[PDB]
């Protein structure tokens, strides 16, 4: 995409990877093979996101009718615990390439990525009430829609009539989606329009990361800290229930994050 090494793809005119670059120059299966192979940085990070989700959805409250999952990418690790606390899930993404990988996975098509190592891992955290083939069927039955997203749009779902949600989940999304704090803050107001009053916001993402790599192809990220996200959340109409910060970072070659944040909020 012209630039090559000097600046992330689709970030020369703008200074941040434009949304177009996610539709055209983005291979989702290449990304899944890199980050979600699954005791490296990636595996340890995925294991921490998983523990936080098992605690949010299985250990604590966060029970409901409908959970809208914003910017799911081509991944399902983030929905394994919520398919126990929610009667229905509505997954979304900007990339059609990503929505495709999700739709292939809901069909159990052999050409879809293997989530077996991950699914079995979450089963072990839950005590193993069920096994992999049983856990994946609960989650697939729970996915009611796969829709196009745009957190950087007043109506994040467009014309789709969706009922108010009890939870809105977003993992590893807004750092790539928003190019500056005004957009990060606005994109959180947009998530609130999908949420019920006193409804949960669950956000997980990297801290202090300005880029992330998918091979040799580079992508933009918003380098923000704990103070920056804490402030962005509260100003967008949310009361923060708890905020976790971990020091684990992605390997040298994969991103310059100083750690990762996990937080639960409530639309107030
Ligand atoms: C693969 C992935 O890039 C997500 N993976 C990762 S792995 C990793 C590792 C380290 C750091 C980071 C990181 N990231 C996210 C960025 C930070 C993806 O699938 N994303 C995020 C970007 N996203 C959108 C783009 C533009 C506009 C959007 C509008 N609405 C909704 C979504 C939109 C689409 C879904």
Residue numbers in the entry: -10 to 27, 31 to 260
Question: Which sentences from the paper describe this structure?
Answer:
NNMT is the major Nam-metabolizing enzyme, and systemic knockout in mice fully prevents MNam formation. As was described by Peng et al, NNMT possesses a class I AdoMet-dependent methyltransferase (MTase) core fold, comprising a central seven-stranded β-sheet, flanked on both sides by α-helices. In addition to the MTase core, there are two extra α-helices at the N-terminus, which, together with the β-hairpin Y203-S212, form a cap over the active site.
In our case, we saw the synthetic feasibility of transferring the corresponding structural motif directly to the imino nitrogen of compound delivering compound in the process. A subsequent X-ray analysis of confirmed the binding mode as a bisubstrate inhibitor. The binding mode in the SAH pocket of the part that is common between and is identical. The position of is slightly shifted with respect to the position of the tricyclic in, but also here the positions are very similar, showing that the fusion between the two inhibitor classes was successful. Further profiling on human and mouse NNMT enzyme revealed that a bisubstrate binding motif does not necessarily translate into an improved inhibitory activity. Based on our crystallographic data, we obtained the correct linker length allowing the important interactions with Val-143 and Tyr-204, and we also observed no obvious strains within the bound ligand.
